[PDB]
Amino acid sequence: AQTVPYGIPLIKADKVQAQGFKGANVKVAVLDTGIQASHPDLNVVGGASFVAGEAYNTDGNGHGTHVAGTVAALDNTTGVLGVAPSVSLYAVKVLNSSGSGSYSGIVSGIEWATTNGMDVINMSLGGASGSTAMKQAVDNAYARGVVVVAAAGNSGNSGSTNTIGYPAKYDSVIAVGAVDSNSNRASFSSVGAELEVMAPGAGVYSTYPTNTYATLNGTSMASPHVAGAAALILSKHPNLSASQVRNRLSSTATYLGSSFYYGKGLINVEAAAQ
């Protein structure tokens, strides 16, 4: 039978889904280690691989399959339930089976998704530095109407130090930090001026290869909650621009404490989508 991971009602995605908004016909690209497209609780409609030797529709790491199910695990009588279980899901493989990738592969994936009409790009990846082409790619995606979401980073706090990674740190990109099921900041979650919102990231249960389900911790688990939440808002107001979706998630978040640690707080998609 179907488990509803705690993140889904914590962000109030269950309430939006119950009004009948589930992300139908919103295109979401998951830039990651690929997706196990044969998993019975996922429906991958397309994708691309910028990684040598691996197709887009297999996942030898498990990371991208897990991130994909938090966005879009099918609503049925098995496995788990995604935040937006009716989205059109695309696997854009920019990370190899060891979980890492090059800047030009990532840039390629961003461009691919912008060129192919994605509505939402999720990047559950980050690096300490970032590059020129990456900045342009995310800026061009956002100016073309794509909501761009990324994991803030799992560097924790460092006294006064901004520890947010790239691409989260670009202001075209929503930087997403992690809370647990008690809505407290997870310790590994990065902090800093660019931190925008928090979502579930500790103890997140989702699809995993092969055909199973697994619990992972990270701002990578938090990010897809916000990607799926973006898809829910668009399924309810299809004419909103990317700025408007982003400002709704931000400005309706539940305040949890200092924005250095929590951004504007915990997303609430019921309030955002209303």
Contact pick of 4, 14, 75, 97 for Cs ion (by CB under 5 A): 97
> Which residues contribute to the site for Ca ion (CB under 5 A)?
2, 41, 74, 76, 79
Comparing CB distances to Na ion, the nearer of 36 and 223 is 223
Maximum Cα–Cα distance across the chain: 47
Q: Whose Cβ is closer to Cs ion: residue 160's or residue 182's?
A: 182
Phi-psi region of 161 (alpha: psi -120 to 50; beta: other; left: phi over 0): beta
In the bound state with Na ion, the residue whose beta carbon lies nearer, of 168 and 256, is 168
Q: For 162, left (φ over 0), alpha (ψ -120 to 50), or beta? A: beta
Position closest to Cl ion via CB: 264
Which of 39, 49, 59, 63 is catalytic? The answer is 63
Closest to Ca ion by CB, 41 vs 59, is 41
Partner interacting with residue 3 (select from Cl ion, Na ion, Cs ion, none; CB below 5-8 Å by kind): Cs ion
Count how many Cα atoms sit within 13 Å of the Cα of residue 160 in the half-sphere of its side chain: 0
Is the bond preceding residue 210 a cis peptide, omega within 30 degrees? yes
- Decide if 32 is catalytic: yes
Known active-site residue 225: no
173 near Na ion, judged by CB under 5 A = yes
Residue 99 binding target from Cs ion, Na ion, Cl ion, none, CB below 5 to 8 Å by type: Cl ion
The Cβ of residue 16 has, within 10 Å, a number of other Cβ atoms equal to: 26
The interface with Cs ion within residues 56-85 (CB under 5 A) comprises 61
Q: Are 208 and 35 in contact (CB under 8 A)?
A: no
Q: Does 175 contact Na ion by CB under 5 A?
A: yes
**CA end-to-end span of the chain:** 31
Residue 31 interface partner, choices Ca ion, Na ion, Cl ion, none, CB cut-off 5-8 Å depending on type: none
Q: Taking CB under 5 A as the rule, does residue 248 contact Cl ion?
A: no
**195 near Na ion, rule: CB under 5 A:** no
Which one among 25, 55, 102, 255 touches Cs ion, defined by CB under 5 A? 255
Angle between helices 132-143 and 103-115 (to 10 degrees): 20
Query: What's the angle, vertex CA 23, arms to CA 218 and CA 168, rounded to 5?
Result: 35
Residue 3 as a binder of Cs ion (CB under 5 A): the answer is yes
187 binds, among Na ion, Ca ion, Cs ion, none (CB under 5 to 8 A by kind): none
Pick from 185, 204, 176: nearest CA to 69: 204
What six digits make up the tokens of 23? 């992300």
Out of 49, 172, 220, 235, pick the active-site residue. Answer: 220
Those residues with Cβ within 8 angstroms of residue 222's Cβ, 6 or more apart along the chain or in another chain = 151, 152, 176, 177, 178, 179, 189, 198, 199, 200, 201, 204
Q: Say which residue the tokens 């530095």 belong to.
A: 129
Is 139 annotated as catalytic? Answer: no
Residues 157-186 close enough to bind Cs ion by CB under 5 A: 181-182, 184
What residues act catalytically?
32, 63, 220
Q: Which positions touch Cl ion (CB under 5 A)?
A: 43, 98-99, 156-157, 171, 184, 241, 253, 255-256, 264-265
Q: Which residues are annotated as a binding site for Ca(2+)?
A: 2, 41, 74, 76, 78, 80, 168, 170, 173
